Structures are given as structure tokens and as C-alpha cells.
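agent: user wants the structure for Type III effector HopBF1 from Ewingella americana. delegating to structure tool.
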Amino acid sequence: AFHDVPSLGQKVGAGSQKDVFHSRQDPRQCICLFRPGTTGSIPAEQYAQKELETTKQLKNLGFPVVDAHALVKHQGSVGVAKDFIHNALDSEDIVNNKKSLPDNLKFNKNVLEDCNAIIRRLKNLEVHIEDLQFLVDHNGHVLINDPRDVVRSSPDKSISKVNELRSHALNNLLD
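agent: tool returned. relaying C-alpha cells verbatim.
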């Protein structure tokens, strides 16, 4: 199920869970390989498969996602081939105040609206997304990234994760 990627492109970005490489096979894509210690006691192949399926379930349910395309391996590293989000902001940096949303108006409106849309869908479908996190693309659109699971459950936990990011955009638009 896991396809070999013979050569990685240039490394990009800075996420703690995966190291991300430009895909030498499709410049719209990137190769995202688990770093040591990031899959807990679950083997990395199972973890990658769970992320791919969950991304596709969320995509099918209408959520905005960092789409995932194929399970890959390179030497002994394991991961997923994914859409490459140029200049992505990692939601974790935002909420931990390691990076800030730009001042741009359109940018912040997009973060606000898309968060609202994600929250609206969480409520309607009543699902919980385990390890919910986001990438914000260069126009301010919010994309669910590397979801671990989705189950029919109380969406309150997931709604709280989204509002955590929305607050920043709301705060900017109020000032």
C-alpha cells in the first residue's frame, strides 16, 4: 500500500510531527514523513493509514482539508503525500504565540469565516476530530491538517479547538 519515493525534494516548513519535502514527482504535492517518536506506541504505517483515511472522510463530509493522496515511504521513513500549502501558517504557532496572523484584512476575514464554517459543520454532523489542527494558507483559508480520527461524538472539544484560532482573527478584525 505504501509507495516508495526514491528521492525527496527540498525540505520545507517546520511542523513538529512530520518533516515535509517538496515532491519531485508533482510540484503541487509534498512528502510528509513522520519524525522519530511522533506516532507513540502505534506503528508509523498504521498512523499514516489512519491520517489518510481520516483526511478523506473529512473531505467527503465537506470539511476543508490539506488533502492527502498516497501512503509513501523513503528509506526507513513513512508518511503521506499531501497537497503542498505554500507559505502555510501552522495553527499551533498562532495559538502558542510563536507566530502571528498577518495584519491583512482579507486574510483575517478568511480565517474568521472558515473557522465559522468548520464550527457550523462540526455542530451539524456532531463529530469529534482527534488531534484537530490547522494550516492557514497564504490567503487566510483554514485547512484541517493531519487529523487522526473522526467519530460521531460531542463536537464541543473540536469546536473549542477551532474557536481558539478564530479568536485571533476576530481580535484583529475588532482593532
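agent: one observation worth passing along. The chain has two domains: 3-83, 89-173.
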